[PDB]
Amino acid sequence: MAPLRKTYVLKLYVAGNTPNSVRALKTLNNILEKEFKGVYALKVIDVLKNPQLAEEDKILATPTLAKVLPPPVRRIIGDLSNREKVLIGLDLLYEEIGDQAEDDLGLE
Amino acid sequence: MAPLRKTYVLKLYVAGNTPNSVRALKTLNNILEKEFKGVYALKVIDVLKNPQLAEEDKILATPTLAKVLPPPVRRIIGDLSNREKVLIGLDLLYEEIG
Amino acid sequence: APLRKTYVLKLYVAGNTPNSVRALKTLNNILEKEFKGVYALKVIDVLKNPQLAEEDKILATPTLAKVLPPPVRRIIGDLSNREKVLIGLDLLYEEIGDQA
Amino acid sequence: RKTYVLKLYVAGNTPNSVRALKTLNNILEKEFKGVYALKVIDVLKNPQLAEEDKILATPTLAKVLPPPVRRIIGDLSNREKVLIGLDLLYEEIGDQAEDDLGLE
């Protein structure tokens, strides 16, 4: 809980959220805090819940920026695009990325 | 006032298709056809029908590019974003013909 | 007028040379003629200043080059294949200085 | 079993340069044998980054490295000014072996 918290956030932009991609997203979320504790941070943006992009938000084609990502990570990114058919694209920015989101209804 | 050479391709990336949404895309296109003869061309992309971007594709925030665009075009783009919420983002290409 | 914000095309070159500097000029020229206020060129000579800023990162050329204007793509190509002085690039939404 | 490849992107080599890159090539294979690998790349030698290559601001990664390695890096950056930036991969090196135990 230091003063700053700037890290190379890996933003994923998805259309929808099918229970399976949500698993994999949770999966990939640990492959990161695990092998790269501190270096990266996942951040998913569902366009269906948030269509309008914020000035700083940019969506690049998965294929391009993927190759510079960790091996196990690239594999998830691959299922997501070619299988779970939900990954629109992604980006890599050194941003704030603080508190978790997803307006909680208590999700149980 | 001349149809020839380099063309701006305005790529709108949409999520959804409300009744108004369709109306305006007909207008924007009509505007670009009758006013920006050639100069500008439109190309709407349905991320629902197909989400994965090709290799040469990218979506940039609307507020950004729409700023430099011609008033009559920013208008329809502003509405497609903050009123119909179908407009995710967009890109600007400078090709020739397709 | 008081500045503005746009997408910056940061090229990272290992030093400079007449040709590379020419093309780097041709290129900059282009973005200010065809892609006004959408893309801004910003060259970073790793030879002059080696250190890297915080949000400053460098991705290989072929990765992020596909998504650029064709002409930007040609020049980027030559600064990388012909002059072989380009390390990589990046595309950030920033706040271009009134100059620097 | 894999290893943290600590790729270092440097701008040329100085006298006080190879100094720490010889002290870093040590501390690692020593206290952290097999743990944190290391491969130095002088851009000036070969600029063009490969499709899977990237360079990141030294303040970012280094800060998640052993307090000591951060010293050689830290010095190597502000003082000897040659460290353009660094990258940290977590993959497996299968180029050479010494002894292993696969289970058929």
Side-chain angles (χ1 to χ4, degrees), chain C residues 2-69:
Chain C
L3 65 71
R4 69 170 198 287
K5 323 143 301 300
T6 62
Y7 284 100
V8 179
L9 177 55
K10 297 186 183 167
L11 273 70
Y12 297 84
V13 296
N16 288 282
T17 78
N19 300 313
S20 82
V21 179
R22 187 194 219 304
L24 274 185
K25 299 186 88 68
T26 303
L27 169 62
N28 172 282
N29 157 49
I30 302 175
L31 299 181
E32 298 194 62
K33 170 199 176 60
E34 295 165 45
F35 295 85
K36 32 63 205 269
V38 182
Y39 300 114
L41 171 59
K42 181 162 181 285
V43 193
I44 298 187
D45 188 339
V46 183
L47 204 32
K48 192 154 301 299
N49 309 305
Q51 299 182 176
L52 208 70
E54 194 55 57
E55 292 91 301
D56 213 61
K57 71 166 175 306
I58 310 175
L59 313 170
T61 289
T63 74
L64 197 54
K66 322 164 185 167
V67 320
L68 289 178

Side-chain angles (χ1 to χ4, degrees), chain D residues 29 31-42:
Chain D
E29 188 175 63
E31 283 179 69
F32 328 85
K33 175 56 202 167
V35 179
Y36 285 83
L38 181 84
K39 209 139 188 180
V40 175
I41 289 179
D42 186 357

Side-chain angles (χ1 to χ4, degrees), chain B residues 8 40 55-58 60-61 64-65 68 91-94, chain C residues 7 33-39 66-68 70 73 91 93:
Chain B
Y8 278 131
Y40 281 82
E55 295 199 316
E56 280 214 298
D57 288 20
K58 79 186 172 301
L60 301 174
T64 67
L65 286 63
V68 302
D91 182 26
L92 186 83
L93 307 188
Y94 195 54
Chain C
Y7 284 100
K33 170 199 176 60
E34 295 165 45
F35 295 85
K36 32 63 205 269
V38 182
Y39 300 114
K66 322 164 185 167
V67 320
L68 289 178
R73 299 172 56 240
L91 185 73
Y93 180 76

